[PDB]
Amino acid sequence: GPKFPRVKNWELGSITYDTLCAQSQQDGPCTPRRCLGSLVLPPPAEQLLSQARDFINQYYSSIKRSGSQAHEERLQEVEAEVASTGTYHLRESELVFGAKQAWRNAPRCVGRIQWGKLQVFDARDCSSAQEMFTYICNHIKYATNRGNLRSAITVFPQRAPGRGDFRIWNSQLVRYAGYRQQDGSVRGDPANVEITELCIQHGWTPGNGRFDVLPLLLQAPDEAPELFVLPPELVLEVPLEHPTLEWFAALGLRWYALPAVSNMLLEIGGLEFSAAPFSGWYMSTEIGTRNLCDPHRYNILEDVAVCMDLDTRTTSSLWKDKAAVEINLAVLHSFQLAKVTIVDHHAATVSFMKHLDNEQKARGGCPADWAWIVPPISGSLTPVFHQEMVNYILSPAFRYQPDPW
Amino acid sequence: KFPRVKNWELGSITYDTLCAQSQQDGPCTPRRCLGSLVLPRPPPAEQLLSQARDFINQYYSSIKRSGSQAHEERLQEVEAEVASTGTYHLRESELVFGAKQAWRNAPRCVGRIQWGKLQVFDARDCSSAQEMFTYICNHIKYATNRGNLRSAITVFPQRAPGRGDFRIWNSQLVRYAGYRQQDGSVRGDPANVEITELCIQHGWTPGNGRFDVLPLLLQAPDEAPELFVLPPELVLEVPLEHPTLEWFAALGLRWYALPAVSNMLLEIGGLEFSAAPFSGWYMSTEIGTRNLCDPHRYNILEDVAVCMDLDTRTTSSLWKDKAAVEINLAVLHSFQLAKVTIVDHHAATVSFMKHLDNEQKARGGCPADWAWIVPPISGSLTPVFHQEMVNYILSPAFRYQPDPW
Ligand code: HEM
Numbered sequence: 001g002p003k004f005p006r007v008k009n010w011e012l013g014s015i016t017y018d019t020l021c022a023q024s025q026q027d028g029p030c031t032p033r034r035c036l037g038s039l040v041l042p043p044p045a046e047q048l049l050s051q052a053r054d055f056i057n058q059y060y061s062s063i064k065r066s067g068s069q070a071h072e073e074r075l076q077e078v079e080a081e082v083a084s085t086g087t088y089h090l091r092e093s094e095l096v097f098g099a100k101q102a103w104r105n106a107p108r109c110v111g112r113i114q115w116g117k118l119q120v121f122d123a124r125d126c127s128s129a130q131e132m133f134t135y136i137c138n139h140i141k142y143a144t145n146r147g148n149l150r151s152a153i154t155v156f157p158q159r160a161p162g163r164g165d166f167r168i169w170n171s172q173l174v175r176y177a178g179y180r181q182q183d184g185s186v187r188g189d190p191a192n193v194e195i196t197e198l199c200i201q202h203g204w205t206p207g208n209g210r211f212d213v214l215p216l217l218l219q220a221p222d223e224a225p226e227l228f229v230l231p232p233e234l235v236l237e238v239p240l241e242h243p244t245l246e247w248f249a250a251l252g253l254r255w256y257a258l259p260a261v262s263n264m265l266l267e268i269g270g271l272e273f274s275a276a277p278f279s280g281w282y283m284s285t286e287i288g289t290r291n292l293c294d295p296h297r298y299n300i301l302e303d304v305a306v307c308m309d310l311d312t313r314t315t316s317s318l319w320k321d322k323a324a325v326e327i328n329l330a331v332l333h334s335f336q337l338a339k340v341t342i343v344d345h346h347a348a349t350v351s352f353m354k355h356l357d358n359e360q361k362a363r364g365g366c367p368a369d370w371a372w373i374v375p376p377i378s379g380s381l382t383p384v385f386h387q388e389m390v391n392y393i394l395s396p397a398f399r400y401q402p403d404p405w
Numbered sequence: 406k407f408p409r410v411k412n413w414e415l416g417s418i419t420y421d422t423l424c425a426q427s428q429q430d431g432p433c434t435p436r437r438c439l440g441s442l443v444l445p446r447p448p449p450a451e452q453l454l455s456q457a458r459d460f461i462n463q464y465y466s467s468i469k470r471s472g473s474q475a476h477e478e479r480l481q482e483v484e485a486e487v488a489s490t491g492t493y494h495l496r497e498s499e500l501v502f503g504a505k506q507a508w509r510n511a512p513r514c515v516g517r518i519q520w521g522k523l524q525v526f527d528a529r530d531c532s533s534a535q536e537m538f539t540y541i542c543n544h545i546k547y548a549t550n551r552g553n554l555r556s557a558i559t560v561f562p563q564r565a566p567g568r569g570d571f572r573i574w575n576s577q578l579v580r581y582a583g584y585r586q587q588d589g590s591v592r593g594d595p596a597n598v599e600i601t602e603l604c605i606q607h608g609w610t611p612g613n614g615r616f617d618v619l620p621l622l623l624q625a626p627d628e629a630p631e632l633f634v635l636p637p638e639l640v641l642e643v644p645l646e647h648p649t650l651e652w653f654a655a656l657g658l659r660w661y662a663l664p665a666v667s668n669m670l671l672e673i674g675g676l677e678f679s680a681a682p683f684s685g686w687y688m689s690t691e692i693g694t695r696n697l698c699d700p701h702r703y704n705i706l707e708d709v710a711v712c713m714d715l716d717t718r719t720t721s722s723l724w725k726d727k728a729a730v731e732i733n734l735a736v737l738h739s740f741q742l743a744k745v746t747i748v749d750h751h752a753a754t755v756s757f758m759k760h761l762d763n764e765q766k767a768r769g770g771c772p773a774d775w776a777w778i779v780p781p782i783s784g785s786l787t788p789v790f791h792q793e794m795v796n797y798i799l800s801p802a803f804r805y806q807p808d809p810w
């Protein structure tokens with residue numbers, strides 16, 4: 001029939017064709033010989049121009065003026081600017097449209113149903129590492145909004161030819177310290193050992209808990225990184241407790257409310273924003289299953305299982321499954337009680353099916369990474385599991401980038 | 406060229422160099438990944454001849470006699486036969502090697518640690534449905550072994566240029582019927598609705614049960630299929646009860662012990678066996694999660710939930726996750742009680758990790774489809790979730806083929 005990928009939903013038996021994949025101008029890791037879909041990781045004025053033209057057309061299409069006078073002029077306005085400086089700048093609303101497009105285009109984000117609701121903070125005037133700090137404090141403030149979380153992204157100056165990038169060293173605006181012990185173990189979060197040690201090498205006076213909030217290593221162009229400590233009043237956290245197991249609270253586990261990625265590059269129309277932290281609100285399994293149960297993270301499965309008096313001697317007791325469920329229930333329950341925005345993997349995948357249906361009608365498909373869309377617990381119990389998906393790269397987009405050091 | 410495969414729990418790395426032996430293509434392309442798709446969207450003597458050499462080369466290397474006399478002589482035989490007749494035949498030993506390799510190369514199978522222990526029944530001297538049926542009965546008696554399941558395959562006559570294929574119409578040799586009730590609902594297994602009808606349309610006296618073992622429709626070349634009924638005593642079944650929830654058994658749930666796929670095609674050295682049913686033993690999740698909990702299957706989550714008195718009012722109570730875990734527990738308990746081989750998803754993925762290791766040293770890699778290797782529940786609580794995988798097509802291989810109607 002149609003010569004586009006055929007996508008089927010094995011629950012509902014429905015079929016769709018992805019025609020949006022044809023707009024993709026960037027190749028992925030696969031080839032007909034082998035699929036590398038499970039791997040976590042992967043200017044020429046000539047090429048910059050085409051990327052920019054493509055973006056501008058996308059913008060004007062979004063406002064329904066393709067072929068118009070404003071459109072053809074803006075195109076000429078960009079070729080002119082690139083023609084005499086090698087780069088070009090985006091208009092305010094062009095930045096707001098691209099930032100939202102990049103989110104909407106993110107194949108791994110299950111929360112894209114919210115893609116249209118992104119508060120974009122233009123911080124392209126920012127010229128000092130101290131100022132970056134200010135912008136972020138504002139970001140954290142606006143997004144945290146006392147628990148009623150709001151999606152937001154702050155965009156710092158774009159990379160300049162022959163100039164240092166604006167960079168945020170931490171992977172997230174809020175992350176707990178990871179202290180390499182004497183005996184080899186790690187106190188806190190093993191994911192952040194390297195960032196923690198980098199903070200110390202830079203003057204941070206380390207604490208010694210399992211939940212010490214790390215300071216930020218911010219960096220203005222061509223200068224070494226300045227170190228900033230977030231005011232505790234700003235970093236809202238939720239102490240975890242179980243709705244029925246009274247001892248869970250005794251574990252002293254907790255998590256911060258704001259998930260804010262900060263080391264990703266925001267690419268729009270060829271331009272590169274190396275410092276453009278974005279935040280939303282958590283899906284419960286991020287905390288409850290990955291951060292708290294991953295063998296290489298807090299690894300609290302055994303502890304909790306012992307507490308529940310489960311048979312952790314044999315696998316067939318499903319002691320891991322039982323505890324993981326309760327840890328997640330606790331993340332959900334605690335956040336709800338503290339009145340901090342959160343969403344469980346059921347609600348979250350259900351709204352993503354809705355997003356899929358919306359996008360089918362609006363663009364003819366949705367780039368999605370199945371392995372990342374399906375939750376880390378109860379996989380086939382959510383509807384996305386039964387939904388085939390086509391994964392590809394559209395731009396604007398968010399991309400991983402080499403750590404600055 | 407060669408892909409780098411990484412394990413994110415241990416930080417270990419490997420290089421898959423086995424994918425370079427993949428002669429057949431997948432659904433992916435550099436532009437878009439279609440790895441989550443469940444199905445893919447006489448032969449010239451020259452092509453068949455090379456697939457045959459390759460396979461014969463594979464076989465002799467396997468027994469350490471490559472280059473030897475027997476090897477060169479065998480290659481001539483195959484060539485003499487292809488040239489003269491446009492096809493050739495396998496020697497029993499070669500057939501046993503091919504079948505074992507086909508299982509070894511099954512990307513979606515997590516039970517491969519066992520690949521070397523497979524009882525192979527050569528049934529190529531079959532000339533009728535009635536004969537196929539005797540063969541199928543012996544396979545079941547052998548594989549079932551009174552609950553101490555043994556992995557087996559039975560291979561019927563290869564396909565032949567212009568002449569119908571021998572075929573087993575059922576997808577598995579043991580399936581429960583799915584009867585469409587008046588109200589659009591379905592009594593029994595909804596997945597087996599079409600097949601349950603085809604048997605009726607071919608004279609079977611249906612039942613009115615939720616777990617009515619279907620009869621087998623066996624088709625010898627160019628002849629309407631024939632209906633055979635499995636002797637109730639040949640089909641071992643397990644009654645499901647819960648290790649602590651006494652009310653569970655009252656649900657009258659039960660599942661068969663033998664998982665035996667019968668509608669897939671086995672390809673060895675370019676030859677095609679359109680009827681080669683194979684079986685092993687179950688992994689608890691297949692029954693507890695997918696069979697009993699899939700929306701489009703027996704869909705028993707709600708019932709079990711209410712029976713556990715759970716707030717099924719909101720998703721955030723995780724009633725679904727809680728119920729699913731108990732159901733998987735009943736399956737594992739029940740089978741261990743009935744002394745019928747079964748393996749839970751933790752033990753299973755652990756052994757698969759070991760297998761990737763033996764395969765790494767042995768062949769330079771191992772094709773795996775991440776989405777299928779990671780269990781349907783508690784995904785990240787298993788080692789496989791954290792393991793990157795390269796997926797491609799090796800031969801001998803098991804392929805999907807059109808339904809014969
Ligand atoms: C509004 C609520 C949101 C929810 C619950 C949500 C949820 C998620 C989840 C569950 C993941 C996969 C995380 C993982 O397993 O590592 C993810 C990935 C991602 N999300 Fe969202 N997201 C939200 C908001 C946002 C916003 C505001 C942006 C961008 C403006 C965004 C951009 C991304 C990107 C680029 C990824 C892929 C990169 C990565 O792996 O971290 N998300 N999101």
Ligand code: HEM
Pocket residue numbers: 508511513514515516517519523556557558666683684685686687688691748753777803
């Ligand atoms: C002995 C233990 C065995 C177990 C626990 C096991 C388990 C599994 C599981 C869980 C899958 C995923 C299927 C699904 O859930 O949809 C799978 C797929 C598969 N297995 Fe195995 N397996 C075993 C033995 C065998 C044997 C004996 C063969 C063949 C000789 C085999 C051939 C395959 C093939 C061809 C597939 C992919 C095709 C499909 O079913 O969709 N398995 N196996």
Ligand SMILES: Cc1cc(N)nc(C[C@H]2CNC[C@@H]2NCCNCc2cccc(Cl)c2)c1
Pocket residue numbers: 040041259260261278279280281282283286
């Ligand atoms: C805005 C936003 C909202 C939201 N709810 N979730 C996210 C996702 C982040 C919060 N949970 C972890 C994830 N961060 C990135 C995941 N791992 C990235 C990675 C890749 C390769 C190597 C390493 Cl070490 C880490 C972002």
Ligand SMILES: Cc1cc(N)nc(C[C@H]2CNC[C@@H]2NCCNCc2cccc(Cl)c2)c1
Pocket residue numbers: 443444664665666683684685686687688691805
């Ligand atoms: C030997 C073996 C042992 C074992 N433990 N499990 C299996 C797996 C099979 C038994 N449980 C599910 C799977 N059957 C095939 C899965 N889907 C097939 C399919 C393909 C196309 C369309 C549809 Cl609808 C279904 C095989």
Ligand SMILES: C[C@H](O)[C@H](O)[C@H]1CNc2nc(N)[nH]c(=O)c2N1
Pocket residue numbers: 038039040371372373413790791792793794
């Ligand atoms: C190796 C494997 O790709 C890796 O563990 C992936 C699997 N799926 C994931 N899915 C999400 N949402 N987040 C992750 O970090 C991962 N990790």
Ligand SMILES: C[C@H](O)[C@H](O)[C@H]1CNc2nc(N)[nH]c(=O)c2N1
Pocket residue numbers: 010385386387388389440441442443776777778779
């Ligand atoms: C479309 C999607 O890939 C499909 O539902 C897959 C996902 N993972 C699976 N994993 C296993 N073991 N078995 C399956 O049938 C599936 N189905």
Ligand SMILES: [Zn+2]
Pocket residue numbers: 030034035036037433434437438439440
């Ligand atoms: Zn792929």
